[PDB]
Specification:
With 130 residues, the chain is mainly α. 30% of the residues lie in helices and 6% in strands. A three-stranded antiparallel beta sheet has the order 1-2-3. A hairpin with a 5-residue loop joins strand 1 and strand 2. It is globular and about 45 Å long. One of its GO terms (molecular function) is lysozyme activity.
């Protein structure tokens, strides 16, 4: 589990095809990861309902991944939640693509909605030479 750099993560996400995935430019995804986890792939947050949020994009164990300890995990991304704490963002990015395609866009992420939606997201990739 590592803390990525901003341009480091922008480059990895660009490579994985997130740029304009579902109409969302890259700065959206980099802003969302900054505010969801401060770029830390190992972050976990436990919730009052017994679900936990895993990794760089704080993906929740009730809906998206299965950790074994969560009431009625749908496991919609078909992954163990531990896969989402790896230094390699691949599992997180592929599950994030199912989440943004679920019908509510990037609004599935509370941090994106509060801290990124409606701000200038272009700044999050400035300087990166992508």
């Amino acid at each position: 589990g590592k803390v990525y750099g901003r341009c480091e993560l922008a480059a990895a996400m660009k490579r994985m095809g997130l740029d304009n995935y579902r109409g969302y430019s890259l700065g959206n995804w980099v802003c969302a990861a900054k505010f969801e986890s401060n770029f830390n792939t190992g972050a976990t947050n436990r919730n009052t309902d017994g679900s936990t949020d895993y990794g760089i994009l704080q993906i929740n164990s009730r809906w998206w991944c299965n950790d074994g300890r969560t009431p009625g995990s749908k496991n919609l991304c078909h992954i163990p939640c531990s896969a989402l704490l790896s230094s390699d963002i691949t599992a997180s990015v592929n599950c994030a693509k199912k989440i943004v395609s679920d019908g509510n866009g990037m609004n599935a992420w509370v941090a994106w909605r509060k801290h990124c939606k409606g701000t200038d997201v272009n700044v999050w990739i400035r300087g990166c030479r992508l």
